[PDB]
Amino acid sequence: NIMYDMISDLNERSEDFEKRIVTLETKLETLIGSIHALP
Amino acid sequence: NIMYDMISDLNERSEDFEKRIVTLETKLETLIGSIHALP
């Protein structure tokens, strides 16, 4: 089904986001911890 | 409808992203402002 093809794309799309988002969030907080913490 | 279940999941998925994205963006610019601004 065409609609399903679309839905499935979005899920692959969406999944990719979840990772990218987690990564960014970690780096961020980390760099912030890497600053606050020690010099 | 199964397809709708899928579509609705994606919206919940997608909504979650919008928040996470806004938050990250704020922290970022902020930390950048917290650097440029004063020491």
Add this chain to the structure above:
Amino acid sequence: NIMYDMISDLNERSEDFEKRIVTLETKLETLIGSIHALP
């Protein structure tokens, strides 16, 4: 089709994310490079 309207919204939604995500990622790594690199 209502379902399609929904699917299309999500794609516009999803597309918007991809940009916002790329931008954030660049700023991040950049600020990190702007720190490591020189003072």
